[PDB]
């Protein structure tokens, strides 16, 4: 029934992808960026709170972010999954682009992780199972994520993960070559200037699991160039508190060799779901969010015609 779920999810996706929804509404600060800001808003007619991303059309064009912006909104309005943010409304006016999405009050996994220090292996596994399912979902749609890290994972009121940003996501069947992502989370094939595929998201999962369970990533240094050197050597050292099952999973995820990396072999995602570290994981209950969480908290008209 995973095959039936994924075939119906791809049908649902393609329809929305091929005919995107536009102009579905009309016009505190939670954060800011170079081409916009995110605000907590209230929908007047229902009294419901949402996060609204306001993007300055002029600043998007100037910073060469047109394609990334059009693409991110296109993905957001087409996807449907429990760990991917629900886009409620999107619209534009003379000056800005607007994306109204679910408000995720818990903040980033990043803050909770630096505060607590490290997560226990069951706690790290609860989040890791949600990422496994999300990538299985995205990859079935030919969507490569390319920016997994604690900074990009919001924790909701039920303690579950919410992914809001798809700034580097690309819908591609085979290989792609863009040098993008975060230095600590880069697969060796992205650093080595060769063509790469969706297996880079499985490498990033390895980095995420290691960082959540250790409290620091497997490869760090004072400068990105020195981090790239450690990644391409692939010499990973594990803390003594890491269980035998964890080290083995991480050895298979943080695999430089693509013909050996878990998630990229003939059995696919099932090499990860059937790993010993995940023996106690109820995959269907994770999907359904029935597992109790271990933690509970006119400018540029031509360029944005498709938005």
């Amino acid at each position: 029934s995973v095959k039936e779920f994924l075939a119906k999810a791809k049908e649902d996706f393609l329809k929305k992808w091929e005919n995107p929804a536009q102009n579905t509404a009309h016009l505190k600060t939670l954060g800011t960026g170079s081409f916009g800001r995110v605000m907590l808003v209230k929908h007047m007619e229902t009294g419901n709170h949402y996060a609204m991303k306001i993007l300055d059309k002029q600043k998007v064009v100037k910073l060469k972010q047109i394609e990334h912006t059009l693409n991110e909104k296109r993905i957001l309005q087409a996807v449907n999954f429990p760990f991917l943010v629900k886009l409620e409304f999107s619209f534009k006016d003379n000056s800005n682009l607007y994306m109204v999405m679910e408000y995720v009050p818990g903040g980033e996994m990043f803050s909770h992780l630096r505060r607590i220090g490290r997560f226990s292996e069951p706690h790290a596994r609860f989040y890791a199972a949600q990422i496994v399912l999300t990538f299985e979902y995205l990859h079935s749609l030919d969507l490569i994520y390319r920016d997994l890290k604690p900074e990009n994972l919001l924790i909701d009121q039920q303690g579950y993960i919410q992914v809001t940003d798809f700034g580097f996501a690309k819908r591609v069947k085979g290989r792609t070559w863009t040098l993008c992502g975060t230095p600590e989370y880069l697969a060796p094939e992205i650093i080595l200037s060769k063509g790469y595929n969706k297996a880079v998201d499985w490498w990033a999962l390895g980095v995420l699991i290691y960082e959540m369970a250790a409290g620091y990533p497997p490869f760090f240094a004072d400068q990105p160039i020195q981090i790239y050197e450690k990644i391409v050597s692939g010499k990973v050292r594990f803390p003594s508190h890491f269980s035998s099952d964890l080290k083995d999973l991480l050895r298979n995820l943080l695999q430089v060799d693509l013909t050996k990396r878990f998630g990229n072999l003939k059995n696919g995602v099932n090499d990860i779901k059937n790993h010993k570290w995940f023996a106690t994981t109820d995959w269907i209950a994770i999907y359904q969010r029935k597992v109790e969480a271990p933690f509970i908290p006119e400018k540029c008209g031509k360029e944005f015609s498709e938005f």
């Binding site: 890290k149 700034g167 992502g181 230095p183 600590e184 760090f220 990105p224 981090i227 803390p239």
Partner: peptide, 18 residues
Amino acid sequence: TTYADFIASGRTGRRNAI
């Protein structure tokens, strides 16, 4: 220790994409 090396790296805060 590896923890002290991490703090010394200056990469303990929010990391930007390249």
